[PDB]
Design an enzyme around this catalytic site. Structure first.
Site, short mmCIF file in Angstrom:
data_model
loop_
_atom_site.label_atom_id
_atom_site.label_comp_id
_atom_site.label_asym_id
_atom_site.label_seq_id
_atom_site.Cartn_x
_atom_site.Cartn_y
_atom_site.Cartn_z
CG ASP A 25 -1.97 1.08 1.21
OD1 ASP A 25 -2.02 1.90 0.26
OD2 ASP A 25 -2.75 1.14 2.18
CB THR A 26 2.03 3.43 -2.78
OG1 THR A 26 0.85 3.36 -3.60
CG2 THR A 26 3.03 2.40 -3.26
N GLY A 27 -0.32 4.27 -0.41
CA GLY A 27 -1.09 5.35 0.22
C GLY A 27 -1.06 5.29 1.73
#
Ligand SMILES: COC(=O)N[C@H](C(=O)N[C@@H](Cc1ccccc1)C[C@H](O)[C@H](Cc1ccc(-c2cccnc2)cc1)NC(=O)[C@@H](NC(=O)OC)C(C)(C)C)C(C)(C)C
Lengths: 99, 99
Positions: A25-27
């Protein structure tokens, strides 16, 4: 490897012996896993996402193997409907976005 | 480009003739943007984050420039604390996770 995004970027992770599924998850600033015990010292923390905040336990200097890649750092534990690998550990396995 | 994750992956987006900053989020099925005007029709939809669900407005086939790349698909609008580009559009611009 290269992970396309047609599906959720779910991979296998090993933490404290146990194998688990987790979302890359880059967020996510932080790495947060489903309620469980981890060895040693922890602090209460509050994290915020879409639709609210949840109370969690912060465990420092924790090792997780992600796709056969060593990564050490802060791991949060709490009522999350999904195991989330955040940037703090993604950087550690040399994870980047390309296009 | 190749974006590293030592910082929030915040790119420049263009939508409805407005320049916004948005988050490249692999851990999101959907693209959710903060309250704004958009042309055409909309439906209601619920989406779930870490804290709960939020009510959002679904617009279809919306043109959106993401980091100098054209995408036309579903944009959700509602009470989100960040502009999120999700997998529906990340795939369109040929974005991949790499390590
Ligand atoms: C500093 O704030 C954070 O980094 N918060 C992170 C966070 O919440 N990150 C947000 C971005 C953000 C940042 C700041 C403030 C508000 C938001 C987007 C994440 O990447 C989440 C992951 C997720 C995926 C799935 C589910 C879920 C929920 C219900 C059922 N099953 C799964 C639940 C969480 N996707 C989401 O919240 C996306 N959810 C999603 O794709 O569900 C399918 C959404 C809503 C943006 C489309 C967190 C993971 C560390 C808490």
């Amino acid at each position: 490897p290269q992970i396309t995004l047609w599906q959720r970027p779910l991979v296998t992770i090993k933490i404290g012996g146990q194998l688990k599924e987790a979302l890359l998850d880059t967020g996510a600033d932080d790495t947060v896993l489903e309620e469980m015990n981890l060895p040693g010292r922890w602090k209460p923390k509050m994290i915020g996402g879409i639709g609210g905040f949840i109370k969690v336990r912060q465990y420092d200097q924790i090792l997780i193997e992600i796709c056969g890649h060593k990564a050490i750092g802060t791991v949060l534990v709490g009522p999350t409907p999904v195991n989330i690998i955040g940037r703090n550990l993604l950087t550690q396995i040399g994870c980047t976005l390309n296009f």
